[PDB]
Amino acid sequence: RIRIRLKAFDHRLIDQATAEIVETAKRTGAQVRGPIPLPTRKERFTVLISPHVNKDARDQYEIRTHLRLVDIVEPTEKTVDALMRQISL
Amino acid sequence: AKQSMKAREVKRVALADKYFAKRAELKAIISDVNASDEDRWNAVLKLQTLPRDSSPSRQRNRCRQTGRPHGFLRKFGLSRIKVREAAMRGEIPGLKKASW
Amino acid sequence: ILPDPKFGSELLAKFVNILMVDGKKSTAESIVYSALETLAQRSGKSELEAFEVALENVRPRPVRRNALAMRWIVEAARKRGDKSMALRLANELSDAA
Amino acid sequence: AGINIPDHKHAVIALTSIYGVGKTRSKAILAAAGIAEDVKISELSEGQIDTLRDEVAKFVVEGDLRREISMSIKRLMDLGCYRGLRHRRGLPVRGQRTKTNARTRKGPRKP
Amino acid sequence: TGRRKSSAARVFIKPGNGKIVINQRSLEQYFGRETARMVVRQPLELVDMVEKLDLYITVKGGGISGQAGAIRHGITRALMEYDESLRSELRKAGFVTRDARQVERKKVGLRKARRRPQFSK
Amino acid sequence: GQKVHPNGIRLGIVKPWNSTWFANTKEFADNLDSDFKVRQYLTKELAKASVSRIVIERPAKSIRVTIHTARPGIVIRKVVADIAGVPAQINIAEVRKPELDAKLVADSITSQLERRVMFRRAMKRAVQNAMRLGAKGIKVEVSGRLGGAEIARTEWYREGRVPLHTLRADIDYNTSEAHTTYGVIGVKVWIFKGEIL
Amino acid sequence: RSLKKGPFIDLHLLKKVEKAVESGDKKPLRTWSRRSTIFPNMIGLTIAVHNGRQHVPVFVTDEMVGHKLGEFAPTRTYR
RNA sequence: CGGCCGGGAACUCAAAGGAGACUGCCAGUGAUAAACUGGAGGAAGGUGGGGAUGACGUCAAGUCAUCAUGGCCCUUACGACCAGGGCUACACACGUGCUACAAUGGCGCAUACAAAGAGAAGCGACCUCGCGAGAGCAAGCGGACCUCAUAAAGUGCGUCGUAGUCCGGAUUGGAGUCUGCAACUCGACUCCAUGAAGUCGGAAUCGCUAGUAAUCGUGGAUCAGAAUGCCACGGUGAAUACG
RNA sequence: AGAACCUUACCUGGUCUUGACAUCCACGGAAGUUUUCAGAGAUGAGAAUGUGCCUUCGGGAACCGUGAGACAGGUGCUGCA
């Protein structure tokens, strides 16, 4: 019912954030299910290094933004308190 | 990449945000084609009285801190050299060595 | 090196690989199937499966001899068209017998 | 008639031989006249050819197309536009590159 | 389960005595080209208990030989979870599975993966 | 001749990024313009305040700027709060090892070369004061017009062990540009602390 | 012009054609917006085009009633 | 008879934390050493594969034209503005690709198979109109669901048959469609017609040893629109490495 | 990693020069808005309206115009600084 999405950059950072979220949700109750890690979006683009004649010189840049989400079967007052201690109703 | 060129860019985007809504309604009344050919002629009349600027066709969206007309991306808003220097010194999240 | 045990004949697998220009395998299998159909007219003495007189050709390790022979046969085959999937085997039969 | 006399060809393939009717125009003519597409001109009877003659004369014919093209290009060259100037001088009109290409338009690569 | 050049394959053991259905379709209807059936039959003919036991297989991704190798790895992992003596017998013959020969990453400054562009003097 | 940036290649390895905030494309661009403008403003207003590291963090519609430096009793968020439409806070982190900070040793090198101290003596004093503190590897380099003459030279001194092909190396690298009467002098400083990751 | 809308002719060129009909005697009709096409009120007119550096006059009649203004006065030259 | 819903967390997938191969073992060779060969186990056996990773210095190599800067110069100016044009011009030569010189070929009909990426001042379901580029309507989606999105070579039937022929597509004409104030120099695409050169390439020269080259297709950055370029991915898939 | 107009750094004719862009002084006016004419546009002259937040109320603060001195601007030259 209530889908709470969250995003981060580092794998350990998103793991710690989702662990804090799931610990608060286990403290609250309402039979919270486990985390749902979604595949991240890779934003790659090639960039010429120098402003003059060089075509081999191109660095490769990687963007790995972790996007996970948790699910709540029913919103209650304790869940609202744990929220106000991305959202989708 | 000059002071004059970035002044041209800021005055162009200012004129675009000024005369955007009237040009948007003009493009809309040009787009709807069911009747009123005389109103279409008056629409292109108002469009020709409107200057050639103030349009996304005129918006070039060059760099901001350098104003480089080449090597631009619509995600960082800077030049290639400047985004490479930013990822070099490390003041932007991500942008590691892509190796797959 | 995966052979083709549908007909066996690792030599025929090498023939498929050498007629498999631009990597097209199913078309080459249709090619060698029409080749088998055209060879079944006479069929020799298991000539549709193996080649005996095609080994001692006019333009000569035995594996390298067989490879050069099949290169010459494929070259003289693809040198002409005119319903190639019959005329190439006709040139092969003329060079063999 | 005297033009377009091939041997052992289909109807739509044969109808391409006329200066002004090709593949899709032949398909449209055969669909409008109810003529079979995969049949040959040798097995085709004259009763359908006598209708195909006026069906193809309804559209442009070889000589009419040639004289229309000649009249259009002579009109353009006497009006003297950019297209007419490039047609008189042997240069393309659709904005091609004449630096290294446009050799078919310019002629043989003799000098 | 197994994979081959980005082709997911799932197998399910079921005795049907000649029941080979893939993606709710027969093998002759889904696959073909008179080569995929033969290269799947190559393990099925030597030591696979070709009768009295069949496999319901599903695929997701891959082309033709990629999916053929994927379902071959699937049925050999089904044989491995079935027993280990047949796994040893298959490995004694030329049936070492899990061949990693995927496609190489496109390089920079080249026209393809391992093709340098042409340059003059 | 052309190597890679140690910090730029070891962003996720040892030394993390100086910015932590996620946004969409237009928001990322506006945020990048904002953080670059406030960093340039802070540097040009407190270049004599021994500023070393600027880290920005934006969890959710709130700016947090931490300045990792030495001698914190110089300044005391008004400028960033006036230039930004988002509430901002500042923090000052007084870090130890003042002779090992790359920005600080680069500022000292630039001040000495502007005060016309000898280049060999300056690099020797820098590497001596950085090795006496208890470090492991220090590589300094001064490029461009060594002495203000018409011939430019790149004079570099190395000591201890400064590895660059080891990815687990705790190496910090910094550039500095001094504007002098002979033009501009570029100083590249490398400092190797330890081997842990 | 996607060949379905009304033809594009600029307002200042239109009002100069109006002034030419009034008293402008059709001679000094200088045109800088050569991007505009021709609509049938301009028949038998002496139109100068600023195709290159200055204005060159051409005579446009009813045979060239539908064309582009830059066709008549080119900007390319050969030795 | 749609995973469509109950049902299940078995399986794929997803992102995490670990593990799995480290000369680990046997025999032989080798100055027991280092090291090498063969073999078992093993998914991977001798840094498995690939990317990234660029030494002191060389070319006083390129950039004061993205930028920063010592100096020199303009400062009613080489500074700011405006419209048109050029950057796309054409006696000619060179470079990198694409299309082909067809029969493993072209075309007509039915039909099998993805990875990866993108999307809201946008993608666009679905219907209707149109032979068409596309137009009116418009739910869903800043997103594993919605959209791009019908992949093709292949398979099955048929058509010709070794000719510039039904290959190929340059040029040109008539008429439209799209973005854009605006498509003439100076966009792309489509309906029809015309269909040229080209029939396998000289001296010479380039890339390639693997599911690589070769062949075919898709996506994206840039961008109002405008790439045979570039950056990534997928389908089929060789021969040779005696030296 | 993209020339229609911008790009454009170039050429033809019209313009403005403490300037298109950052800052100082003294004075007038909040800012802003609709719209007409000459004109290829840059540009000049009008016709109405709005008149705030604070009031030391000879004025604060962004903003528009007038005059001058600093300066500014330069994709102009020197990578052989």
PDB file of C-alpha atoms (C1' of nucleotides) in Angstrom, chain H residues 9 14 26 38 40 59 72 81 87 92 97 104 115 123 125 140 155 157 164 184 207 219 223 236-237:
ATOM      1  C1'   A H   9       9.707 -17.706  -2.058  1.00  0.00           C
ATOM      2  C1'   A H  14      17.496  -7.468  -8.655  1.00  0.00           C
ATOM      3  C1'   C H  26      51.289 -36.073  -7.944  1.00  0.00           C
ATOM      4  C1'   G H  38      52.119 -33.498 -18.412  1.00  0.00           C
ATOM      5  C1'   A H  40      43.853 -35.731 -11.551  1.00  0.00           C
ATOM      6  C1'   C H  59      59.938  15.763 -29.583  1.00  0.00           C
ATOM      7  C1'   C H  72      53.220  43.993 -26.938  1.00  0.00           C
ATOM      8  C1'   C H  81      25.382  46.255 -31.684  1.00  0.00           C
ATOM      9  C1'   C H  87      31.796  28.660 -42.659  1.00  0.00           C
ATOM     10  C1'   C H  92      41.984  19.056 -59.093  1.00  0.00           C
ATOM     11  C1'   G H  97      33.306   5.190 -43.901  1.00  0.00           C
ATOM     12  C1'   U H 104      25.387 -18.041 -49.441  1.00  0.00           C
ATOM     13  C1'   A H 115      21.133  -6.865 -24.538  1.00  0.00           C
ATOM     14  C1'   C H 123       7.968   9.559 -24.620  1.00  0.00           C
ATOM     15  C1'   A H 125      -0.584   3.838 -25.548  1.00  0.00           C
ATOM     16  C1'   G H 140       0.097   5.608 -18.378  1.00  0.00           C
ATOM     17  C1'   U H 155      13.065 -20.460 -41.112  1.00  0.00           C
ATOM     18  C1'   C H 157       6.358 -21.061 -49.891  1.00  0.00           C
ATOM     19  C1'   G H 164      23.435  -3.719 -65.864  1.00  0.00           C
ATOM     20  C1'   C H 184      16.236  29.423 -51.507  1.00  0.00           C
ATOM     21  C1'   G H 207      43.193  -4.136 -39.663  1.00  0.00           C
ATOM     22  C1'   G H 219      20.056   2.477 -28.300  1.00  0.00           C
ATOM     23  C1'   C H 223      20.768  18.954 -30.776  1.00  0.00           C
ATOM     24  C1'   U H 236      25.117 -15.775 -36.550  1.00  0.00           C
ATOM     25  C1'   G H 237      29.981 -16.976 -36.516  1.00  0.00           C
TER      26        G H 237
END
